[PDB]
Symmetry: C6
Subunit: 196 residues, 6 copies
């Protein structure tokens, strides 16, 4: 899918934060969006067609794949990218506000820094909430054999995944870049409070 409407919105705010926000937007663009667009999404091209179970009961493959993957990793990461960008847009809702009021002055320690720090803490608690949800549901490593225990299958079946290693490497990689994007917010908030 295209990423063009949010591109002009993230482009419109570029010279109102410090260097940390600029390199945070840089690692958001390069290491998250581009890497998902080229290599990451193509790896999950066949998640269901290459799935295979060792049985003959009809429909056991569907329910066992549904139990094994309640949601794919790539759509989870897409929702994570969406939910951590929109805290910054209200910052623009400050700017096009106050310039207009300066425009009103053209005719005839404020809330800016407060809106800034509340937006930053919102995006950080969103980041840590998504990391906690992923820790609770999936873990951080896919084995190559799953054991399925669902109706209408008989007693216990075992199903073999598709590429359990190439997914593991990218899971670890997205974990590391999310941790660095977590730490940078801590650095910037400490810098602003030190300049506070």
């Amino acid at each position: 899918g295209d990423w063009s409407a949010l591109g002009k919105l993230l482009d419109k705010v570029q010279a109102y934060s410090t260097a940390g926000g600029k390199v945070w937007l840089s690692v958001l663009f390069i290491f998250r969006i581009l890497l998902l667009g080229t290599a990451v999404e193509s790896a999950w091209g066949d998640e269901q067609s290459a799935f295979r179970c060792n049985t003959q009961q009809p429909g056991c493959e569907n329910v066992c794949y549904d139990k094994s993957f309640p949601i794919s990793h790539v759509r989870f990461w897409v929702l994570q990218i969406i939910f951590v960008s929109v805290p910054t847009l209200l910052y623009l809702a400050h700017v096009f506000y106050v310039m207009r009021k300066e425009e009103k002055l053209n005719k005839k320690r404020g809330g800016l820094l407060r809106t800034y720090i509340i937006s930053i803490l919102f995006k950080s608690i969103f980041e840590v909430a998504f990391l906690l949800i992923q820790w609770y549901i999936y873990g951080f490593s896919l084995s190559a054999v799953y054991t399925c225990k669902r109706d209408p299958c008989p007693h216990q079946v075992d199903c073999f995944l598709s590429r359990p290693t190439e997914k593991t490497i990218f899971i670890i990689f997205m974990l590391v870049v999310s941790l660095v994007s977590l730490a940078l917010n801590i650095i910037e908030l400490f810098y602003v409070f030190f300049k506070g």
Copy 2:
């Protein structure tokens, strides 16, 4: 499919409403169009190929899938996006009218607010009508086993769906964002009547 012709039309009206209409257009662009373009549409890539029924009678799969899904959710949401945007375009039909009449004045509590509020109530009754149609037809949760009762199949068959959980999460998500877009119109109409 591309979304470019309506993009310039929704871009052409941006500074004639309040902040509520602006953030309504924001959640229309981001949470509806982009999310449908990237992650939502790819989930329904195999609705029929991964469908499977437990029988041998030829053609029972076609009629049972037709009965189970009279219309897909993604095309329903596309029609919902189309039908709730066109009430605003007549607002532009006011503006390019009256500026031309001001242009005519260049040569030689009116109907604006009324057209505004009638357009807003039209888009809200369209929204609630589509929510009621979806409540009546589908419900809000897909089970993993369907029971089919149609000719030319024999007595009763049962067919297993494809990903009954990953669709359920996005159904709930589109429900929530439609409810918020419903409530925002109420907020803006009360604000205009309070300033009325």
Copy 3:
């Protein structure tokens, strides 16, 4: 396929007709082109692969599908979109004519309204001709079981379609929007004759 060469041609004439021609071009862009581009075309993605007949004679599926669908609905609608736009282009052939003659005057109840009304009646008779052809060939509702009576199959076979309801809804929808685009030409011609 792309729609870009005719886009600049339909964009080049925008301020030489009344409001009826403008909203006619609006419903031409939104409700015909965009809806075909996003949702309508994807529904007919598998017209032949999901087709299925109840026999063993080799090649009966090909001839029975050929008899059932002499031409698909989506390509018929594409030809209908093409044939009803080109009557307006000759209007541009007037304008870039006469401005050049006004350009010639820069150096050293006419045929405009007549060309206008002949173009409008041509596009309306094209519209009603295509509606009559579709009424004669297909009807307006697809059943879910077809009976095929062609060589080299044996006596009579029956073949099951693919999604007979989701196609029916869009057939009815294109019928309604074609009827409204038919009525608007009547409104505009009566308005011009009343101002005649």
Copy 4:
């Protein structure tokens, strides 16, 4: 495939011919390029996968399809579009020549009309040559049953095509528009000789 490099070249010459060349370029853009881009090419999406022969000898399908279709119609039409556009480009090779010589004059019944008419007769003899090649090889109607007489198959086999009618309609349509583009060159050359 994209059509963008030749687009700027056909756009660069637009105001150096009469109205006949302009409407010839118009029917070249609309009725040839767009119709091939949207509807025509998608009809030949499965020419080989839907092909089917009534035998068991391995590889008979490949040689019988190769004998039945030495070249597809759509690539033939693509080559026809390419070969009839390049006679006009040398006209540009006149213009950017002589303006430069007029540029040289800025510093310190000719060959134009002759190059024009030789380019037009070249494009017309190319058009009639391609029509004659298509008449000689294919004819103008595809039957629904082919009889194949090639090694390594046994004595005689018969193979069933894919959509013999929807291809026939577009074959007839491309024939008609090629005939009109043939006649327009005759009209323009007679007009220039009458003004000669």
Copy 5:
């Protein structure tokens, strides 16, 4: 794949050579890039899926297809297009050099023609080297039956190709246009030496 980065580089040098280099770039754009982009690449869409061998030994199809096609023709032509364009870029490395030195003069029979002729002879020897490699490996005509003599297959097998004629026509066509692009360099070098 896209061709956009080298497009601006080939566009940036357009008015520093004679008419022969201009029409050479013209036949490079039209007859090589566009024809590969639209019709040529789609013909080789199924090179392996439509391949078929007459045996039951598992894996014989893979090794026999590997022996029959060490590299496909379309990727060979892509490498040929890449390797014969980069001799011209150093010409730009002259121009943006010397203009800068003229820029230096703004502040406070040379090597141009030599770099020109060395670039032209490099691109011609690259062209003839690629023609010789294609003559040595493949020949210029694909038969319709291949005989395979590789382990782990038994004694001798025979495999049937996919479309042996439609590939032959384009092989001959690319041969002819490569020969014309070979001859044009000879014409231009003789013209420069005659003006030398």
Copy 6:
């Protein structure tokens, strides 16, 4: 996937290095990005579907393909392209710094060369690290028969690859262009130290 966000970043720094950095960016654009975009990626279109093993045990194909390819070559090259470009961006972080400080001077042997050489040595050690990882894991030649020794398969199986030669040629080609991009950094650092 698209490559557009990093394109403007690599375009924004073009006139702050010597000719070696310019031709290094040239071979980065042409021989790495374009060649991956057109021909290289299409060769690995069917890495798993054309994979084939000589057994009947269910799921042995999945684990044997997973052991044979822990990560594909094309995604490895994508990560290599990403990791060797970002050392240069900090150079921009110098420039938009110091110009702003010159902008500050507008109102009222330094660290530039040091940041330059540290960025260049970082990108070279990244290049040699990726070459060493590829040497350690894969080698530089793919055989056509693999021997698999993993549970749940029985004792030893053998699996046949897909196109072992067309991949070998591009492996060797990427090796050569990576070696040249390695040597050019050595040339430029020696040139700067000689001018040091």
